[PDB]
Write the structure tokens for this entry.
Amino acid sequence: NLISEQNVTVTMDLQPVLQLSMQGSETVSFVFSQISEYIGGLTQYGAVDLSVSSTVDWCL
Amino acid sequence: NLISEQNVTVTMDLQPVLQLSMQGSETVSFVFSQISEYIGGLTQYGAVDLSVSSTVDWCL
């Protein structure tokens, strides 16, 4: 039972990837100068959007 | 507790709205040429009207 052997060591790392990419304007400005704006207020549509890249279970 | 975050800054300004709109004649003329006008005087009805648009408490 003569034995000649060679060994290799395998190292595997699962680095966590957590990315939150936001597109839009980092300043959102509401300007009230008319009466209508005062009574009803500015409604801004699609100001900021968020995209999520993840490896594990995530909650935003 | 890996964290990926994005921040947006919201700026809200409440600009004061103060409007006094006058309708009528900016010159009001009283002409006295008859005796009756002298003794009793001209009475002018609805010479000037004022409309107020405001955001805060106001006194006219």
